[PDB]
Design a protein around this ligand. Structure first.
Ligand SMILES: Nc1ncnc2c1ncn2[C@@H]1O[C@H](COP(=O)(O)OP(=O)(O)OP(O)(O)=S)[C@@H](O)[C@H]1O
Ligand SMILES: Nc1ncnc2c1ncn2[C@@H]1O[C@H](COP(=O)(O)OP(=O)(O)OP(O)(O)=S)[C@@H](O)[C@H]1O
Ligand SMILES: Nc1ncnc2c1ncn2[C@@H]1O[C@H](COP(=O)(O)OP(=O)(O)OP(O)(O)=S)[C@@H](O)[C@H]1O
Lengths: 614, 121
């Protein structure tokens, strides 16, 4: 009766059908039965990386014992799962634990070879009674005679920390190595569990969802292992579907809550403004509502789309079908990007191309998406281009990772981006390039001024470009599969179009230029196109003055006089920004803090033959 | 040999019919070991120091399944101290770590890549 209170049963639960059907892995089952039926030293320890199924094998053995495919030897054995937490429960007195354990063991030894014990997580055997080691190695003279069959299941790396420390126990246990499967059998494992999820959520799951979630989840979520990493998408997609069985969908709830919020704020202020955005949002919410009704007049199952929406929600790399939500943006993308960068169109199209080939799935699945270096003279706008394609992909400007290779003058500064080896000073922080990516892995990475780095940083990114893995000091292999790398330079500012390709080849190696994508050349500027830069700069400086709601009224002769002063094409578009302040800035500053330009109406600017007044 | 020839594609193709996959190989990259103290990430750390119960990255990926093929990509850039660690790997088959176990490389297929010269006659 001592086994009754301190231990449950599995075979009695298996006869009632409370275990999920265990599919595949006949080799490990036959190996466990082969180990388990020998004469002496008969207890397997299932060992593998966590998640691959090491309790499901024991439940499959329970299913086979209840069914009856076992041989004559293991005939009707009734596996009993023990505990180690409900035995050290209250034992503050001196001999209170030890007679308890010895009573359990005498009950196991008493019966006629029936009971096969099953301790899960057996690394807790070692530190049992903290008195001077007495407990845990009490069962050591009993395992050698083969008296309790003791099937266990511990992980791989919690084994050489505890059990290999105490190697007198280590030779009692045999070992069964359970490695993960591949996709080709994980599809078959998924297809058999598609009954219990229909019960707990009364919905229907298409087979296309399973063959998608096995294939799609192995490129994106790389922190888990193959069986455990693919069920969760199916379950959470079923929950996504069951949430919307409430009378409305999601967008309508979102919009209702949003407009209620803006309503609240607005009425509390009683700002205009919001008044408009209210109305617009009320138009939208109206339209959708009507659409909803329409549809009703005319969903209840999951498909291969909602799996992709789960994977796009978590680890926020979007990986859907492009269901028209951004297709109008991805066709108006060269047009949108040419609102902040003017000209250089032959290398704007070449960057738009490396995204539009990759949203539609044509590019190589295991290689970084965009890994290319663009260069030219100084002032063209090659840094402003990089901060303007992260502007509409992310609605951000600091979500990119700007790391700067003008500080890496010496050789040994490489370690600040890969972290210290194990045993030295900083071994908690890891890398700095690694740990910035491993959370939110979709950002854009810069490398400003690749010139002035020492020629040893180049041999670290030689495996970043081609096969997108990188290993930090710990051993977490982070992967740069779907980021966008950017390299800048200044080599050969105004030399030629062929001298510039003679200094690039002379500084790098014939194994590093080949790793790259298309190496681009930014051109110079033109005196005709300089006016449109002045337009954007004055628009920016007019937007800045919303602190005190002034604006500017600018005449065309001023707007072209500031363009005709954009001289010296050694410097590019940079000195025009200084010219804007030396004409308009300090003049308006002196005009401002002497009173008299209190906020409200703007000022007019006007030329006066050499300078310009206000 | 020279670059762009197929010297990495070969070492991933003979790991294809031995294992029925292409990701079950020990792929370490020695393009990062420019200095003399990145030995410790593949050999462990001596006892008494910070990361002690971690093993090495080369060591505790063999002792589990002692049959995987091992790469070594771009061995030129390693400082000539990593070669000293590699010297008893060859022709004996065993090395040590902090815990004091001699892991046996007696039946794996070591593979070394390089790009030296790249066009010598
Ligand atoms: N062959 C299989 N047949 C049926 N279900 C499986 C199979 N392999 C894995 N599973 C399921 O995948 C999950 C694996 O969970 P467990 O194996 O219990 O966790 P674990 O793999 O033992 O990891 P730890 O270390 O015990 S937390 C469960 O939901 C199992 O039902
Ligand atoms: N083509 C352009 N279109 C719009 N603004 C531009 C353009 N070129 C330059 N500018 C402006 O001038 C600034 C300088 O551009 P930058 O890209 O910083 O110069 P650069 O390309 O970094 O050259 P180096 O060699 O890196 S200093 C930008 O931040 C913009 O404000
Ligand atoms: N003879 C070949 N047969 C098939 N594919 C080849 C052949 N030669 C090259 N390739 C392809 O070339 C690409 C790159 O070859 P890699 O071997 O990866 O480069 P590499 O030969 O290692 O040179 P380095 O020094 O590493 S840059 C791969 O996609 C290979 O498939």
């Amino acid at each position: 009766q001592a086994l009754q209170k301190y231990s449950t049963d599995l075979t009695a639960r298996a006869r009632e059908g409370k275990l999920d059907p265990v599919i595949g892995r006949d080799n490990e089952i036959r190996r466990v039965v082969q180990v388990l039926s020998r004469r002496t030293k008969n207890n397997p320890v299932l060992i593998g990386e966590p998640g691959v199924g090491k309790t499901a094998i024991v439940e499959g053995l329970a299913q086979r014992i209840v069914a009856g495919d076992v041989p004559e030897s293991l005939r009707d054995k009734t596996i009993v799962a023990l505990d180690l937490g409900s035995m050290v429960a209250g034992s503050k007195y001196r001999g209170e634990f030890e007679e308890r354990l010895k009573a359990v063991l005498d009950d196991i030894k008493n019966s006629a070879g029936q009971i096969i014990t099953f301790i899960d997580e057996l690394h807790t055997i070692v530190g049992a009674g903290a008195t001077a080691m007495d407990a845990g190695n009490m069962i050591k003279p009993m395992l050698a005679r083969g008296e309790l069959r003791l099937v266990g299941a511990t992980t791989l790396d919690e084994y050489r920390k505890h059990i290999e420390k105490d190697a007198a126990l280590e030779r009692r246990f045999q070992q069964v190595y359970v490695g993960e499967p591949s996709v080709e059998d994980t599809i078959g494992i998924l297809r058999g569990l598609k009954d219990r999820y229909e019960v707990h959520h009364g919905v229907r799951i298409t087979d296309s969802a399973l063959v998608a979630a096995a294939t799609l989840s192995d490129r994106y979520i790389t922190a888990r292992f193959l069986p455990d990493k693919a069920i969760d998408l199916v379950d959470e997609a079923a929950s996504r579907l069951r949430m919307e069985i409430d009378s409305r969908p999601v967008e309508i709830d979102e919009v209702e809550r949003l407009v209620r919020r803006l309503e609240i704020e607005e009425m509390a202020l009683s700002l205009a403004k919001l008044r408009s955005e209210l109305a617009d949002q009320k138009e939208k919410l109206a339209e959708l509502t009507t659409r909803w009704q329409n549809e009703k007049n005319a969903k209840e199952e999951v498909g291969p789309d909602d799996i992709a929406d789960v994977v796009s929600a978590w680890t926020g790399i979007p990986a859907g079908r492009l269901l028209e939500g951004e297709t109008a943006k991805l066709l108006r993308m060269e047009d949108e990007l040419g609102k902040r960068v003017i000209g250089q169109k032959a290398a704007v199209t070449a960057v738009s191309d490396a995204v539009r080939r990759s949203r539609a799935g044509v590019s190589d699945p295991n290689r970084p998406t965009g890994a290319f270096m663009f260069l030219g003279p100084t002032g063209v706008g090659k840094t402003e281009l990089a901060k303007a394609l992260a502007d509409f992909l992310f609605d951000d400007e600091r979500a990119m990772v700007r790391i700067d290779m003008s500080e890496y003058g010496e050789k040994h500064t490489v370690a600040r981006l890969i972290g210290a080896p194990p045993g030295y000073v900083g071994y908690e922080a890891g890398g700095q390039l690694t740990e910035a990516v491993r959370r939110r892995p979709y950002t854009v990475v810069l490398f400003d001024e690749i010139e002035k780095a020492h020629p040893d940083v180049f041999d670290v990114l030689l495996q970043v470009l081609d096969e997108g893995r990188l290993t930090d000091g710990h051993g977490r292999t982070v992967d740069f599969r779907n980021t966008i790398l950017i390299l800048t330079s200044n080599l050969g500012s105004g030399g030629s179009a062929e001298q510039v390709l003679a200094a690039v080849r002379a500084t790098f190696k014939p194994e590093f230029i080949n790793r790259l994508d298309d190496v681009l050349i930014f051109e110079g500027l033109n005196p005709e196109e300089l006016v449109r830069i002045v337009d954007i700069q004055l628009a920016q400086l007019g937007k800045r003055l919303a602190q005190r709601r002034l604006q500017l009224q600018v005449s065309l002769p001023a707007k072209r006089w500031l363009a005709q002063r954009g001289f010296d094409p050694v410097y590019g578009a940079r000195p025009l920004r200084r010219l804007v302040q030396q004409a308009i800035g300090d003049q308006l500053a002196k005009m401002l803090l002497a009173g008299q330009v209190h906020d409200g109406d703007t000022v007019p600017v006007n030329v006066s033959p050499d300078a310009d007044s206000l």
